[PDB]
């Protein structure tokens, strides 16, 4: 009716006002501020270990809290825990649904989470007294495939799904204690704040949102890509975050001033990004591409500083330890690589 | 051995046992057949399922285990999870041909034959299915021979001229489907006619997969 059209007009002019507000609070590019400093030399990183034993495409990995263990997931229906210093295998966990998309490691070391293409998130207890890993909880209630999961605590978790919905969950009761809605297309990723008070998500409608854990408050919306968005990470400070899209581009967004900070694009790359991650000082941005190799970017000048050319297929997943020691990389050839 | 300690020489053995289990279990996944089931809404997907997020299905024909994946309830984007089925043996595609004048609940004008034709076209040229064969099922032929005599198929086929009988109309529809292929050398479309028969479906699938396996083996050793 007429009310529909008048509300739509009001919404459009609010959108114009918000666009003008975002535009008017920018003065200079981040490159101009970051151009005085000198660029890091050619980062030469060699394969120190080579983790092998996966028999299919690898979709996710996550670094442990003490920076010596990690976990990985593949379509073979297995989850694996490693010892990076020795190249041993600590645990092998069979999965129920072979179609996985993510995994996560508890910040204490007791639990790992998994799930994908089934709309269910499963939790696993490592430090049981029976010696084996068991299934702790099965968070169900989503209607699209699960695209990410990240432990908030030892009893609180947050997930994003393909049904355009994020959710905050208790493992004990098993019921959603908060639901985040407002996306149009499938949600591809989420990343948690350093202090576990906020978290960002990115979806298949070329948009990302900043949520709020305590009540369900949608605080801010970021845009800019013209394709899907399947990788996000906070900066170690917690005042920024970077995105990796499907149109061969990565971007930097600021929380306090909500505009674009850095575009990481190169003409010789015509294929989209799968993973992004940062470095302990927030100086290196590692991007996993599907031209079969990763890339290292000086996160203050946008220019390349190294290539981890060691894989036969597309790169899925990628991570950095908490102490800054190494970087781990997985791909579709089923080989993990640690670089120093 | 010498450089290690008594509590770093059992970690290695444990890791070796992990490796052995992983390798022995990854041999029961490279001998099974994977088949991806598709259809256009009420195209009889359930019908063929009974004739024999994700819905797994298990059956065994002639000492050979098949795994049928039914992904009809996803109701989400296809391009974000389709490549997870890249290494599949074949795609089964079920559609009912007695449904040319019966239109979709969405549009009165558009019928379901055209929608299913667009679906078959869209699944036949994705980059992840370049060498992936498609087994085609045409359904509800019993109701069709009654329906076609009452009303001509010129309604759905304005550029068609035929005497409005069973065989010529069925063959024309079959040609209209198989002309949608755009590769024609690496790929082959296998087509079949069944309504409620209890023998032809699974045997048809078995023949169509044995041919693909023979081609795969012969091109693996260079000879092909």
């Amino acid at each position, epitope marked *: 009716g007429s009310e529909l059209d008048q509300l739509r007009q009001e919404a459009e002019q609010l959108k114009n006002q918000i666009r003008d507000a975002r535009k008017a609070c920018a003065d200079a590019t981040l490159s101009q501020i970051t151009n005085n400093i000198d660029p890091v030399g050619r980062i030469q990183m060699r394969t120190r270990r080579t983790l092998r034993g996966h028999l299919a495409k690898i979709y996710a990995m996550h670094w442990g809290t003490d920076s010596r263990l990690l976990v990985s997931a593949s379509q073979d229906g297995k989850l694996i825990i490693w010892d990076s210093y020795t190249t041993n295998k*600590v645990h092998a966990i069979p999965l129920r649904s072979s179609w996985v998309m993510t995994c996560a490691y508890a910040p204490s070391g007791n639990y790992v989470a998994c799930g994908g293409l089934d709309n269910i998130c499963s939790i696993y207890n490592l430090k049981t007294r029976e010696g084996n890993v068991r299934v702790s909880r099965e968070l169900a209630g989503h209607t699209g495939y699960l695209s990410c999961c990240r432990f908030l605590d030892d009893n609180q978790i947050v997930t994003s799904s393909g049904d355009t919905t994020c959710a905050l969950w208790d493992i004990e009761t098993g019921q959603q204690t908060t639901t985040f809605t407002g996306h149009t297309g499938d949600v591809m990723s989420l990343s948690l704040a350093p202090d576990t008070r906020l978290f960002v998500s990115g979806a298949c409608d070329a948009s990302a949102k900043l949520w709020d854990v305590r009540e369900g408050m949608c605080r801010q919306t970021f845009t800019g890509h013209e394709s899907d968005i399947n990788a996000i990470c906070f900066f170690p400070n917690g005042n920024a975050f970077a995105t990796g899209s499907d149109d061969a581009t990565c971007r930097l967004f600021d929380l306090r001033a909500d505009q674009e900070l850095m575009t990481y694009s190169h003409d010789n790359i015509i294929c989209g990004i799968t993973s992004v991650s940062f470095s302990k000082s927030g100086r290196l941005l590692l991007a996993g591409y599907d031209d079969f190799n990763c890339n290292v970017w000086d996160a203050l000048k946008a220019d390349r500083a190294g290539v981890l050319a060691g894989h036969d297929n597309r790169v899925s997943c990628l991570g950095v330890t908490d102490d800054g020691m190494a970087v781990a990389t997985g791909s579709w050839d089923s080989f993990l690589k640690i670089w120093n | 051995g010498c450089t290690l*300690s008594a*509590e770093d020489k059992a970690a290695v*053995e444990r890791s070796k046992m992990i490796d052995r289990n992983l390798r022995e279990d990854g041999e029961k996944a490279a001998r099974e057949v994977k088949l991806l089931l598709l259809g256009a809404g009420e195209s009889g997907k359930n019908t063929i399922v009974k004739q024999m997020g994700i819905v797994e299905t298990h059956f065994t024909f002639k000492d050979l285990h098949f795994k049928m994946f039914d992904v009809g309830a996803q109701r989400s984007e296809r391009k974000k999870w389709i490549h997870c089925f890249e290494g599949v043996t074949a795609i089964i595609f079920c559609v009912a041909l007695s449904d040319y004048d019966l239109v979709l609940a969405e549009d009165e004008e558009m019928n379901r034959m055209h929608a299913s034709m667009k679906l078959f076209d869209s699944i036949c040229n994705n980059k992840w299915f370049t060498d992936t064969s498609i087994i085609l099922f045409l359904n509800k032929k019993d109701l069709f021979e009654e329906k076609i005599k009452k009303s001509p198929l010129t309604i759905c086929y304005p550029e068609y001229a035929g005497s409005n009988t069973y065989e010529e109309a069925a063959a024309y529809i079959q040609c209209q489907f198989e002309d949608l292929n755009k590769r024609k050398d690496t790929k082959e479309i296998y087509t079949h006619f069944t309504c409620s028969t209890d023998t032809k479906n699974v045997q048809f699938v078995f023949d169509a997969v044995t041919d693909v396996i023979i081609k795969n083996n012969l091109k693996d050793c260079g000879l092909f």
Partner: single-chain antibody
Amino acid sequence: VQLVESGGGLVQPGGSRKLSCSASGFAFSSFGMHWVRQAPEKGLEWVAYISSGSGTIYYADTVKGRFTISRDDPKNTLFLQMTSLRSEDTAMYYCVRSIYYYGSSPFDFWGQGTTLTVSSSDIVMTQATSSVPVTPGESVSISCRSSKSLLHSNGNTYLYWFLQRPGQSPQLLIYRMSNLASGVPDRFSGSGSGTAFTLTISRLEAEDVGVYYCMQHLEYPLTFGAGTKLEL
């Protein structure tokens, strides 16, 4: 979770015996298994070791050649078989489970014990004292010492403090000289360096009284100090 072992009794000098244990409540196939004999005359030491996978088998030089160790992994059972029993083969036997992966805590659950009576180089660890009288509410300290350094290539000092209360089986207190086992109160602690170490207790209770022991694991055979009783 429990280890119930049987097989004890009184034996002739010339004659064999068998000691079996059933491990009900956990994944027995992922656990290396030790036997630790405890002579009634304040005797303590490691006996034999069999790993997860029947690959390795270790003995202490005083026992090699006359004892054989085995598993029944489908049925979750552990076996020891003894052929030659000298007059000094009279003691009590404790079957200990332990699992070795990074971060694990071996020697965790210690069975119950089975008594065996007989008819009538190695590292050295030292606990010079034998008795320390003390009153509750105040701190106590016990010392143990070895003959060479324990900071191995992996930086881990393989010293295990553990306790035996009168009439009870032992239980792990401090694995690797700086880590406290699970289920025990946080009153116990331990610190040292080089070849000398001390167990320390800050608040003293009625349960804390008992005899304390120190273990080395750098290489087989596993060797101890002596016992240092605390008395009320």
